[PDB]
Amino acid sequence: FNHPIQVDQLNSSYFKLSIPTNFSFGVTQEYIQTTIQKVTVDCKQYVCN
Amino acid sequence: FSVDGYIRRAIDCGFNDLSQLHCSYESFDVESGVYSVSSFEAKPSGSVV
Amino acid sequence: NECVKAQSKRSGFCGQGTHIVSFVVNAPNGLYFMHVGYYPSNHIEVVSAYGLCDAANPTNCIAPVNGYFIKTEWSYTGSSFYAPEPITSLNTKYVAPQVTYQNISTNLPPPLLG
Amino acid sequence: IQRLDPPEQDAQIDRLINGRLTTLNAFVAQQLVRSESAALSAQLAKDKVNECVKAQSKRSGFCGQGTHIVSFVVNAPNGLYFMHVGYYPSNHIEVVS
Amino acid sequence: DDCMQQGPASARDLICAQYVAGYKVLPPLMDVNMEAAYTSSLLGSIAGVGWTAGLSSFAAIPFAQSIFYRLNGVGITQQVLSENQKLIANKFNQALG
Amino acid sequence: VGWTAGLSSFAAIPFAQSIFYRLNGVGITQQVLSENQKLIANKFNQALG
Amino acid sequence: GFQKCEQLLREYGQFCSKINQALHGANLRQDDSVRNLFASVKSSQSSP
Numbered sequence: 001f002n003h004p005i006q007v008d009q010l011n012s013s014y015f016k017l018s019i020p021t022n023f024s025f026g027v028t029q030e031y032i033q034t035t036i037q038k039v040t041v042d043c044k045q046y047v048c049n
Numbered sequence: 050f051s052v053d054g055y056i057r058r059a060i061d062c063g064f065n066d067l068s069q070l071h072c073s074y075e076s077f078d079v080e081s082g083v084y085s086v087s088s089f090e091a092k093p094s095g096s097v098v
Numbered sequence: 099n100e101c102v103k104a105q106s107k108r109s110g111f112c113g114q115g116t117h118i119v120s121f122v123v124n125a126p127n128g129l130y131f132m133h134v135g136y137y138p139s140n141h142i143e144v145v146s147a148y149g150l151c152d153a154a155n156p157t158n159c160i161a162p163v164n165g166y167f168i169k170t171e172w173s174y175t176g177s178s179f180y181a182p183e184p185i186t187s188l189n190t191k192y193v194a195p196q197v198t199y200q201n202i203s204t205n206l207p208p209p210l211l212g
Numbered sequence: 213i214q215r216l217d218p219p220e221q222d223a224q225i226d227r228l229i230n231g232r233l234t235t236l237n238a239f240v241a242q243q244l245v246r247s248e249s250a251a252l253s254a255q256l257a258k259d260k261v262n263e264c265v266k267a268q269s270k271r272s273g274f275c276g277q278g279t280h281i282v283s284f285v286v287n288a289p290n291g292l293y294f295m296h297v298g299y300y301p302s303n304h305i306e307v308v309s
Numbered sequence: 310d311d312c313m314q315q316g317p318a319s320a321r322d323l324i325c326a327q328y329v330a331g332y333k334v335l336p337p338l339m340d341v342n343m344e345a346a347y348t349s350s351l352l353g354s355i356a357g358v359g360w361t362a363g364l365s366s367f368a369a370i371p372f373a374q375s376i377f378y379r380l381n382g383v384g385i386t387q388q389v390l391s392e393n394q395k396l397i398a399n400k401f402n403q404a405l406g
Numbered sequence: 407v408g409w410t411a412g413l414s415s416f417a418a419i420p421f422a423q424s425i426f427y428r429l430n431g432v433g434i435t436q437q438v439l440s441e442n443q444k445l446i447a448n449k450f451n452q453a454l455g
Numbered sequence: 456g457f458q459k460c461e462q463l464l465r466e467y468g469q470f471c472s473k474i475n476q477a478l479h480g481a482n483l484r485q486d487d488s489v490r491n492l493f494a495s496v497k498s499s500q501s502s503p
């Protein structure tokens with residue numbers, strides 16, 4: 001289990017801010033299928049030749 | 050078949066591809082579109098033994 | 099429409115991290131999305147205020163806009179990147195006073211110097 | 213096998229085969245339908261965690277009923293159980309605005 | 310082994326049927342403690358995730374403080390929330406209890 | 407397209423300018439983006455490259 | 456386990472290969488669905 005960064009709450013009127021000091025860009029790649037191959041069948045030929 | 054039972058109109062379902070279309074929908078009126086129909090068969094030109 | 103023609107604010111809808119920009123190319127049976135996100139790193143912990151009030155004038159309070167008020171006295175940082183800058187009227191909004199806001203009496207930022 | 217000779221034995225075994233092949237095809241067809249459905253549903257769960265739980269939603273009816281405030285998630289036998297806490301108004305009055 | 314040393318729990322026991330009929334139920338991808346870990350870490354992230362701009366920083370603030378920002382964000386003023394903090398917590402608690 | 411209110415007008419602005427508005431919109435201040443424009447472009451380029 | 460049956464089953468083609476592959480794919484689908492779902496529930500930062 002990959003634990004998240006633990007950030008403690010404070011007993012006060014203040015709060016802890018876990019804030020980045022660095023960054024990177026990255027690319028999430030995603031494929032979405034929109035079609036399937038369209039097929040027709042000559043059923044009479046398929047079955048009886 | 051008319052109300053009086055006589056046949057006044059018919060389709061020869063093997064005449065052409067358009068006729069095959071009408072027969073597959075069992076109707077003299079089908080909607081516009083592009084439809085697959087039975088393939089045009091290659092026929093033997095002889096035999097080998 | 100959400101990703102490519104717009105910047106999305108929906109976590110996880112587009113890619114991971116904070117969405118910035120997406121691109122689309124065609125794929126064999128559909129579309130291939132190319133989602134560019136912002137990925138933070140090297141997080142540090144700092145102490146923040148919920149807001150700041152003028153101690154002498156307790157009804158005059160501010161809250162940060164798209165960022166935080168941090169100790170360093172008080173300064174502002176944007177929410178995605180730690181980079182302290184002065185608290186100004188461009189990074190604050192006036193708010194109703196709250197019990198969690200700090201009462202500041204010395205180096206009052208310009209929105210409270212009234 | 214114990215009762216019949218091959219020409220009839222074959223026909224009887226074949227009936228059992230056809231019935232069992234049919235059963236397995238039906239089973240598989242449903243596992244594919246059910247797994248496709250569960251996968252779509254899983255993406256809905258994904259959206260709710262991000263929209264509901266990790267964020268306050270402004271989308272009426274997406275999370276729970278009423279105005280969304282906070283949601284929680286626990287696991288359930290075949291998925292997630294969402295606990296959506298909403299704000300429900302009552303005793304409305306009419307005023308002039 | 311349970312199905313041999315104890316046998317079926319009842320009529321139509323579909324778990325013991327596996328070793329008889331020829332089918333097998335496979336285990337899930339994650340065990341229970343791992344799934345619990347995911348929703349537990351999710352619970353602890355709620356107050357500090359749905360707080361401000363960007364998904365990159367975490368505000369480790371009290372749950373209660375988060376609720377009041379969530380209520381303010383839907384149209385309940387701060388004067389009201391301040392006068393009613395105990396009333397609000399009690400109603401919330403009734404909703405979950 | 408992803409620049410301002412409405413879907414009816416088009417701002418023909420540089421890609422780079424669009425990126426900086428997109429970064430500002432997620433919490434990176436303008437002082438930071440201004441100091442780091444080359445750093446940001448390089449990180450973006452690494453992500454795609 | 457009856458050999459006569461298996462002999463007749465073969466005349467139906469690779470029936471069982473199809474059953475196994477269809478279910479294998481269907482089962483992988485849940486492991487992928489679960490992996491993706493949890494990857495998204497996962498927090499970056501969290502309080503104890």
Ligand SMILES: *[C@@H]1O[C@H](CO)[C@@H](O[C@@H]2O[C@H](CO)[C@@H](O[C@@H]3O[C@H](CO)[C@@H](O)[C@H](O[C@H]4O[C@H](CO)[C@@H](O)[C@H](O)[C@@H]4O)[C@@H]3O)[C@H](O)[C@H]2NC(C)=O)[C@H](O)[C@H]1NC(C)=O
Nearest residue numbers: 013151153156194195196197198199200201202391392393
């Ligand atoms: C920065 O300065 C502010 C302003 O002084 C300060 O917040 C104030 O703190 C006081 C308490 O220290 C709050 O006063 C009371 O606190 C008790 C706590 O239990 C409440 O029960 C009281 O409520 C009753 O009385 C109210 C009077 O009108 C009624 O309206 C209410 O219904 C109850 O009958 C009362 O709240 C005071 O309200 C807050 N101020 C605000 C704006 O909330 C703040 O704490 C200082 N900053 C720091 C970090 O110390």
Ligand SMILES: *[C@@H]1O[C@H](CO)[C@@H](O)[C@H](O)[C@H]1NC(C)=O
Nearest residue numbers: 009010011012013014198371
């Ligand atoms: C510290 O936490 C305890 C927990 O009960 C609480 O009672 C006490 O008032 C808190 N102190 C401060 C400064 O908030």
Ligand SMILES: *[C@@H]1O[C@H](CO)[C@@H](O)[C@H](O)[C@H]1NC(C)=O
Nearest residue numbers: 020021022023024138139140
């Ligand atoms: C950010 O991380 C990269 C990773 O190699 C590092 O090279 C760079 O120096 C880091 N910047 C800061 C401010 O730590």
